[PDB]
From a paper:
Each nanotube was derived from coalesence of three protofilaments derived from the dimeric protomer. Among all three structures, the helices within the dimeric asymmetric unit could be superimposed with only minimal differences. Structural overlays of laterally interacting protofilaments indicated a conservation of the interfaces between the three filament structures. However, the axial interactions along the contour length of a protofilament for the Form II-like assemblies appeared quite robust and comparable in energy and buried surface area to that of Form I protofilaments.
Numbering used by the authors:
A (entry chain 5), B (entry chain BA), C (entry chain HA), D (entry chain NA), E (entry chain TA), F (entry chain 0), ...: 101 to 129
J (entry chain d), K (entry chain j), L (entry chain p), M (entry chain v), N (entry chain X), O (entry chain R), ...: 1 to 29
The structure:
């Protein structure tokens, strides 16, 4: 099951990346 | 059943890949 | 019934393959 | 009835085959 | 009634055969 | 699981970044 | 976990910044 | 944790600032 | 923690200011 | 006993819906 | 007893729907 | 009793729908 | 009692629909 | 026992919904 | 035992909902 | 045992809801 | 053991609610 | 162990409620 | 240990309630 | 240790109740 | 130590009750 | 020491009860 | 007094329902 | 007083329903 | 007072329904 | 006294329900 | 006394429910 | 005395519930 | 004496519950 | 004496609860 | 004497609770 | 003597509580 | 003698409380 | 003799209280 | 002899009270 | 003095209860 | 003084209840 | 003072209830 | 002060209910 | 202050209800 | 502040309802 | 801020309803 | 009114006569 | 009224006659 | 009324006759 | 009334006969 | 009444026969 | 009554037989 | 009654057999 | 009764076997 | 009874085994 | 019984082992 | 019993070890 | 107030008159 | 206020008059 | 306010007048 | 506000006038 958990971890990491990228774009605006 | 679980794991991995790729594209924009 | 379950497993595996392939194409774009 | 179940299993197997073949074609594109 | 059930089983078997044959043709394309 | 926790941490960090950036924009207005 | 806590701290700091900025704007009005 | 506490302190300080500013406006009215 | 306490003190001071200002307005009416 | 035959008819109607959906696919192409 | 015959008619109508769907497929080609 | 005959007529109408669908197929070719 | 005769007429009309469908087939050829 | 066949029909209807959704996808393209 | 098959059908219906949502995405683009 | 499969279906339905929400986002843009 | 998978599905549903709320934000703009 | 994951989901749901409230704010403006 | 995470979620939910109340204020204006 | 965080959340919830009451005032006007 | 923070929260809740009562007054007018 | 703060909160709650009673009076008029 | 007549009308309506049911029987034959 | 006449009309309408049901019988024959 | 006349009209309409039902009978013969 | 007549009407309505159920039986055959 | 007749009607309604259930059986066959 | 008849009706209703349950069984098959 | 009949009805209702549970079993299969 | 029959009914109801629990088990599988 | 039968019913109810708990276990898995 | 059987039922209920607690454990995992 | 069995049941209930507490621990983690 | 078993149960209940307190500790952390 | 075991249980209960007090301390912090 | 009028109202309410009970009687007949 | 008027209103409400009960009687007839 | 007017309104509402009951009577006739 | 006006509105609403009841009477005639 | 205006609107709505009831009267005539 | 305007709109809507009721009167004549 | 404009629109819509009601009056004449 | 009742009695008598005559005819068949 | 009751008695007698005659016919079949 | 009761008795007797006749027919099958 | 009771007895006897006959048929299968 | 009891006895005997016959069939499977 | 008891005994015997047969089947699996 | 007791004994014996068989299967896993 | 006791003994023995088997499995993990 | 006691002994032995095994696992962690 | 006592001894020994192992882990931290 | 005592001794020894280890950690802080 | 009391007296006198008149009528019956 | 009381007195007097008049009419019947 | 009270008095006087006039009319009938 | 009150007084006076005038007309009839 741990594989599922680490998959979730990578999911959330990517989500955070999307968030901070949108943040950088907002900062550029 | 464990085969189903690892299938799900690979599913979510691919989903995370899609997410981070869309994130990289957003970053390029 | 287990045959049905492993059939489902292969289904989901193929679905994940489709997903990651679409992801690679998105990455190429 | 089990015959019906294994018929379903073969159905789903063939469906998965169609899926992964379409996936390979998508990959070729 | 069981005769009806096994008839259905053969039906679904033939359907699966049609499916996998169409799949092989798709693979050839 | 700790990976999930640190993912959450990065999430919240990014959220705080969004917040303070919106704050800086409000300050500019 | 402490990382989560300091993330929260930064969150609340940003919130306070938003608050005092809104306060400065109210003062300007 | 003390960081959280001082964050709270700054929060409440900003709140007091909002309060006294609203008070000054009320006084002007 | 004392910072929190003095924050509270300033809070209550501002509240008293609001009160006496409302009182002065009532007196003007 | 008739309800058994009702279930059989349900089986067959399901199969019919399968074929109808297959036609829907093919028409969609 | 008649409801038994109703179920029989339901069987037959299901079969008819099967054939109709098959025609739908063929027409769609 | 008449409802029994109604069920019989339903049987026959189902058969008629079968033949009609067969004609639909053949016409579609 | 007449409703019995109505059911009889329904029988006959069903048979007529059968023959009509047969004609439809033959015409379709 | 019939409820077992009801479950079988449910299986098949699910498969039909799968195919229908696949058609929906393809039509959407 | 049938409830097991009900669960299987639930699996398949879930997969169908997945595909339907994917179509919804693609249509939305 | 079937309840295990119910949980699996719940997993998949959750994933479907994820994709549906993603579509909701994209449509909202 | 299944309840573990229930918790996993809860994780995923939470993530879905996150995305849905994000869409709600974006739509609100 | 699953209850740990329940707590994780609670974390995420809390974050979702945060975002939802943020949307509520923005909509209110 | 999980109860610690429960407390964290409580922190976050409190923050969410803060934002919700802020929205309530703004809506009230 | 978690109870400390519970107390922190209590602090924040108190602050939220403050803001909510402020909104209640403003709405009452 | 946490009980100290509990007392702080009690302070704040008291202040909130003050404001709520003030709103009660104003509403009563 | 915290009990001192408890007494302070008691002071404030008393004041709140005063204001609440004043509102009760005014409402009673 | 009128309610007495209402009861009389109820009597008559009951009798009418009797006759209607008798007709239902006869029609059913 | 008029409600008395309403009851009378109810009597008559009941009688009418009687006759109508009698006609229903006779028609059914 | 007019409602009295409404009741009278109701009487007459009831009588009309009586005659209409009588006609229904006679027609049915 | 009228309630006595209400009970009589209840008797008759019960008898009507009897006849209606008898018709239901006969129709079911 | 009327309540006696109510009980009689209850008897009859029970008998009607008996017949209705018998019809339910027969229909179920 | 009427309550005796109520008990009789209860007897009969119980018997009706018996038959209804028997129908439930048969339908379930 | 009637309470004796009530007990009899209780006996019968118990038997009915038995049959109902048996149906529940069979349906569950 | 009736209470004896009440005890008998209790016996039977217990047996019914047994069967119901058995069904609960089987359904749970 | 009846209380003896009450004890017997208690025995049986205990056994039922045993089976119910067993089902609870199995469901929990 | 019956109290002996009561004690037996107590034994069994204790065993049931054991199993229930075991289920509680397993669910908790 | 029965009291001996009561003591036995007490033993078992104690064991059950042990297991319940163990579950409480595990849940607490 | 039974009181000996009561003492044994007391031993076990004490042990259970030990474990419960241990859980209380762990939860408190 | 049993009283010896009672004393043992007293020992254990004392130890439990120790642990409970330790938890009380830790909770108090 | 008002309490005298309260007693008067009690008198009247008693009389009303008398009439209501009389109606209860008459309805019961 | 107002409570006197409350008593007066109680008088009147009692009278109203009287009339209402009288209506209840008359309706019951 | 307002409560006096509340009592007046209570007087009037009582009178209204009187008239309403009078209407109830008249309607009942 | 506003509550005084609320009482006035209550007066007027009472008067309105009076007139409405008067209309109810007149309509009832 | 706005609640004062709410009370005014309540006054006016009451007056409107008065006029509406007057119309109800006149229409009823 | 907006709620003040809401109250104003409520005033106006009340006036509109007044005029509408006046029209209702006039139409009723 | 937008909600302020919503209130303005509410004002205007109220005025529109006023004019519409005036038209209703005039049309009614 | 009693005249109406005896009219009803004669009605039902005639109905019973019709019933038993139809019964005699059924017996002759 | 007793005339109505005996009319009902004769009704039910005739109904029983119909029932037993239908029973004799069923027996002949 | 006893006439009604004996009518019911004959009703139920005839019903039992129908039941046992249907039983004899089932036995012949 | 005893006639009703013995009627019920014969009813239940016939029911038991039906049951054991169905049992013999099941045994033959 | 004893006749009813022995009827119940025969009922339960037949039920047991059905049970053991179903058991023998299960054993044959 | 003893007949009822021995009927119950045979019931439970058959139930035990079903149980041990299901056990033997489980053992064969 | 002893027959009931030995029936219970056989019940519990069979239950123990089921338990140990499930145990042997668990051991095989 | 001793048979019941030894049945319980075998029950608990089997339970202990299940426990130690689960223990061996835990040890293998 | 001693058999029950030794059963309990084996129970507790197995429990201790589970405990020490969990302890060894904790030690390995 | 001594077997129970030594079982308890082994229980407590294992508990002490768990304790000292947790202690060693705490020491490592 | 002495085994129990030495078990307790080892318990308390381990407890003292936990205490002094916590003490060493406190000393390190 | 005494006027109210004598009014009540006359009320009750009239009520008694109604009662004795109804009594005389009952006596005439 | 006394004017209100005497008004009530006259009210009740008139009510008594109505009562005794209705009584005289009942006496005439 | 007294003006309102005397208005009420005149209201009730007029109501009493209406009552006694209706009473005189009833007396004339 | 007193102006509003006296307006209400005049309102109620006029209402009483209407009432007594309607009363005089009723008296003339």
């Amino acid at each position: 099951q741990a594989e599922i958990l680490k998959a979730d971890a990578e999911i959330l990491k990517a989500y955070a990346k999307i968030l901070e990228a949108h943040a950088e774009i907002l900062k550029a605006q």
